[PDB]
Amino acid sequence: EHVAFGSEDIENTLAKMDDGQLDGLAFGAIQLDGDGNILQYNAAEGDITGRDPKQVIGKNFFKDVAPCTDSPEFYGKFKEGVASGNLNTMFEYTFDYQMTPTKVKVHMKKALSGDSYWVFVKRV
Numbered sequence: 783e784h785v786a787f788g789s790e791d792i793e794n795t796l797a798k799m800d801d802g803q804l805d806g807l808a809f810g811a812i813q814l815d816g817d818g819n820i821l822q823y824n825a826a827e828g829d830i831t832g833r834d835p836k837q838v839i840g841k842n843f844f845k846d847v848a849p850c851t852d853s854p855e856f857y858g859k860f861k862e863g864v865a866s867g868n869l870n871t872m873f874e875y876t877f878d879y880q881m882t883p884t885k886v887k888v889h890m891k892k893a894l895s896g897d898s899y900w901v902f903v904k905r906v
């Protein structure tokens with residue numbers, strides 16, 4: 783798939799993409815429910831972070847997979863967006879739990895489908 787990171791209509795392009803389609807993207811893509819449980823997780827994300835995209839589905843991103851994100855700067859933004867029903871924020875961050883610290887750019891954006899939120903990730 784040819785979709786740019788940060789593209790304005792990304793939620794429309796990715797909407798209802800199956801797991802296989804998402805694996806064609808040139809950046810990491812995670813879909814979370816409103817509680818932070820992982821619904822989808824693509825190959826590019828697993829290459830960035832080391833996690834196995836097959837095993838993380840169903841785990842809680844903030845409580846277990848990615849505790850380094852449970853701060854106001856990441857999780858706090860996420861839950862504000864869930865509470866309001868509108869989320870569109872892009873910021874750099876470092877992923878450092880049980881891994882070499884890895885600097886990324888994160889884009890969180892509400893998905894079109896119900897109770898769904900995208901977390902997009904690229905290397906910086």
Ligand SMILES: *C(=O)/C=C/c1ccc(O)cc1
Nearest residue numbers: 831848849850851877879
């Ligand atoms: C901090 O604990 C970050 C961890 C992490 C970020 C993103 C992922 O896809 C997996 C783990």
